[model samples]
Target: VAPAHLEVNEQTIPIVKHQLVKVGRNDKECQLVLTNPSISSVHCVFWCVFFDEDSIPMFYVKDCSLNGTYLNGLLLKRDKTYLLKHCDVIELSTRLVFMIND
Candidate 1:
């Protein structure tokens, strides 16, 4: 599998497909789980709609809570990776708990 590229192989998925995932329209969405709690990295790729499409990327979030997703957490930033602090409330998925097959 290719490592990193605009096309998918072992990593990276086109953007819109990930949108359907956030809505629970595919399996990859179910496979999602928070790994890096730092920063505000948010991305997903659905396993269903992979044809020939593209998007400008999408994400969801509101102002940080007093406690924030993590204690003393900052508002989520986009298009970049962040350092997740301790106890950050990492959201798994909007519709399901992420599950991965070994």
Candidate 2:
């Protein structure tokens, strides 16, 4: 496996391939926090795991507040787990957008 991380906007966040991860509006609680009203305090959970020898980014996003999480401009299923592919676009609460790169 190579060095993997999430490119949150212009920032590079190294993926913690050990345990459960969180991303949301509250910086005091989440590792990669998105500070915006469109996002909830605890918006989503992410995990970096290996699948078939390929390190994959797994996302479990839930609908919160007003807008919802989107994958490639499509609405994401609340409380559902999704495996991300290369160059996949994820929009959080219609405000923040990030891409997955391997």
Candidate 3:
């Protein structure tokens, strides 16, 4: 895979991919079992422009756990586990959709 850069003069940020991977969604957590098993570890972090540079992140919807990262709805803690409430409009990462049932 090539290096991914964050551009200074851009409104859209593109996520780079090396290979296709199957990310499966269960009733709870969605699993990203990458096809390139060569990747030892890929950490998921939520990024938001909503906060200032030095501002401590209270939440970023994309990089959050269950209940899908909201600013006004609920709480998110390190040790606690959460679940997806269907049709939750997460404003981060292009406003992704969360669904539990198949």
Candidate 4:
């Protein structure tokens, strides 16, 4: 099976298995850096959990932004882990957007 990734600007960013990837505007700290004024230094976090070789890995996201993170247009609670399914849309502070793809 193909690995999961985030689709934005018609480009794909690979997700690391079992690793916490910080997403934000900060280039020094975040694994995925976004270029938006509303994006915080540490906006959100992505985690890909590997279950087994037989099943697909599960993806999650935690909101850590001042403005907010949106999952499919719904506001995500700060510091709370939310399951991210394939094709799910993620919006950072209503400015930047991306989609989970497998």
Stretches > 4 Å off in candidate 2: 1-3, 51-66, 94-102
Q: Would you list the clashing residue pairs of candidate 1? A: 37-84, 38-82, 38-83, 38-84, 39-82, 39-83, 69-88, 69-89, 70-88
Which 10-residue window of candidate 2 scores lowest in summed lDDT?
A: 56-65
- Worst-scoring 10-residue span by lDDT in model 3: 1-10
Q: Which parts of model 1 have CA positions greater than 4 angstroms off?
A: 1-25, 33-74, 91-102
Of the pair 2 and 3, which is ahead by TM-score? Answer: 2
Arranged by TM-score, best first: 4, 2, 3, 1
Instruction: Tell me how candidate 2 scores on lDDT.
Output: 0.63
Candidate 2 has a TM-score of 0.71
| Shift in Å, residue 32, candidate 1 | 3.1
Q: lDDT for model 4, on a 0 to 1 scale?
A: 0.77
Per-residue C-alpha lDDT of model 4 across residues 1-102, encoded as one tens digit per residue? 235667664456677666777889899998778878889999998878777776667888899999999998999999999998777888888333444454
Per-residue lDDT of candidate 2, residues 21-93 (tens digit): 5678888878778878878887776666656456444533344434668877888777777776655667787
Cα error, residue 66 of model 4, in Å, equals: 0.7
Task: Give candidates' CA RMSD values in order.
Answer: 12.0, 3.5, 15.6, 2.4
lDDT for each candidate structure: 0.28, 0.63, 0.29, 0.77
On TM-score, the leading prediction is: 4
User: Model 3: residues >4 Å from true position, as ranges?
Assistant: 1-68, 71-75
C-alpha lDDT of residue 36 in model 3: 31
